[PDB]
Amino acid sequence: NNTHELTAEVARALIARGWRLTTAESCTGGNLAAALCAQADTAAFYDTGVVTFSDEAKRNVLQVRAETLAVHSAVSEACVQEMSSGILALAGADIAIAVSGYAGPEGGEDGTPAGTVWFAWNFRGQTETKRMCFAGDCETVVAKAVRYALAALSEKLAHWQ
Amino acid sequence: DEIDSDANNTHELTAEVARALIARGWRLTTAESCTGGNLAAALCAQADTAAFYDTGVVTFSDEAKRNVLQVRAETLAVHSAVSEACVQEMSSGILALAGADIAIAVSGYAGPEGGEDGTPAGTVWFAWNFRGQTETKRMCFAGDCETVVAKAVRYALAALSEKLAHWQ
Numbered sequence: 430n431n432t433h434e435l436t437a438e439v440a441r442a443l444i445a446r447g448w449r450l451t452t453a454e455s456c457t458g459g460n461l462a463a464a465l466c467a468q469a470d471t472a473a474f475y476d477t478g479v480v481t482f483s484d485e486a487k488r489n490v491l492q493v494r495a496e497t498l499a500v501h502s503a504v505s506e507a508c509v510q511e512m513s514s515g516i517l518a519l520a521g522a523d524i525a526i527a528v529s530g531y532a533g534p535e536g537g538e539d540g541t542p543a544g545t546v547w548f549a550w551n552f553r554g555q556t557e558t559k560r561m562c563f564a565g566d567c568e569t570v571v572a573k574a575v576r577y578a579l580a581a582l583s584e585k586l587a588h589w590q
Numbered sequence: 591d592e593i594d595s596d597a598n599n600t601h602e603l604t605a606e607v608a609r610a611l612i613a614r615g616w617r618l619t620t621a622e623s624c625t626g627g628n629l630a631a632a633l634c635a636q637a638d639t640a641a642f643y644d645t646g647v648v649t650f651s652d653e654a655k656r657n658v659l660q661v662r663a664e665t666l667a668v669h670s671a672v673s674e675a676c677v678q679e680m681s682s683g684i685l686a687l688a689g690a691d692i693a694i695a696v697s698g699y700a701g702p703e704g705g706e707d708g709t710p711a712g713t714v715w716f717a718w719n720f721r722g723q724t725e726t727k728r729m730c731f732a733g734d735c736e737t738v739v740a741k742a743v744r745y746a747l748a749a750l751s752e753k754l755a756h757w758q
């Protein structure tokens with residue numbers, strides 16, 4: 430239900446399967462990593478997270494393509510797909526989550542509204558994505574995005590194996 | 591008790607840090623273990639993050655430190671990850687990766703358990719690396735793991751705020 434409960438449910442499920450997770454964040458700032466590290470048994474399923482807040486960081490740390498960022502922006506399906514692939518490869522994990530969005534109060538230069546967040550969940554190179562538009566102040570958007578990432582991961586585990 | 595003080599507030603510190611970095615055209619990067627990304631999260635909650643910060647890592651294990659930050663296996667074997675030598679190497683690795691002016695590394699035992707070498711729970715090492723010039727500090731914070739983490743993040747930032755008032 431709350432962030433701690435969601436994170437505990439993810440941990441138990443991943444540990445039972447012997448799966449490992451990694452994360453790449455932009456707007457959520459390391460709060461997704463923080464939830465996973467606050468969990469009791471972190472090292473049994475997680476050890477690597479990155480925060481890549483700018484286009485240069487995404488290119489440099491995660492090998493996101495310059496052309497992708499210039500054409501689609503950092504807040505895009507293509508960006509989160511590439512972020513997820515980059516972190517999956519760096520960490521040698523089973524599952525990568527990438528999150529990129531506009532926490533607010535400003536939206537994108539291209540008119541993308543504040544609160545728009547893209548997600549990618551990449552299981553061994555098979556990636557699913559979702560765009561959400563969260564209501565609230567910037568800190569509330571971030572908190573909702575972290576919980577969405579975790580809840581959706583919990584839901585997706587079933588169809589993977 | 592100016593720098594390690596419950597009378598400090600993390601967002602207030604982050605505001606002061608941002609202004610000082612922006613005024614000098616300096617960029618900050620971070621590498622964390624026990625603090626879990628909460629240091630990055632403070633810096634990213636700050637409103638104009640991109641003007642002074644864009645890269646953080648969380649390297650929760652010895653292997654992640656070797657892989658992501660090129661911490662030497664030998665360093666970890668002799669000194670452990672909760673050590674002066676490790677935070678020095680973490681800070682150098684992230685400074686290089688990010689191309690930043692200043693790197694903070696933090697590595698500790700947040701709790702409830704301590705180190706296998708007997709290091710008490712609550713022991714946290716810090717490194718602040720300004721363009722190569724690295725200073726370190728060992729702290730021992732009281733409280734549960736959530737509390738230790740919050741204190742360590744606040745200390746890292748308060749000490750950075752102080753250092754920014756003197757660096758050149």
Ligand SMILES: [Cl-]
Nearest residue numbers: 433434437438
């Ligand atoms: Cl629970």
Ligand SMILES: [Cl-]
Nearest residue numbers: 442443445446
């Ligand atoms: Cl399971």
Ligand SMILES: [Cl-]
Nearest residue numbers: 445446447590
């Ligand atoms: Cl399995």
Ligand SMILES: [Cl-]
Nearest residue numbers: 463466467626
């Ligand atoms: Cl945490």
Ligand SMILES: [Cl-]
Nearest residue numbers: 455456482483
């Ligand atoms: Cl961002």
Ligand SMILES: [Cl-]
Nearest residue numbers: 496497500501
């Ligand atoms: Cl394209």
Ligand SMILES: [Cl-]
Nearest residue numbers: 515516518519
């Ligand atoms: Cl990569």
Ligand SMILES: [Cl-]
Nearest residue numbers: 522523553554
């Ligand atoms: Cl994989």
Ligand SMILES: [Cl-]
Nearest residue numbers: 558559560561
């Ligand atoms: Cl969608």
Ligand SMILES: [Cl-]
Nearest residue numbers: 662663664665
């Ligand atoms: Cl060596």
Ligand code: NA
Nearest residue numbers: 610751754755
């Ligand atoms: Na200052």
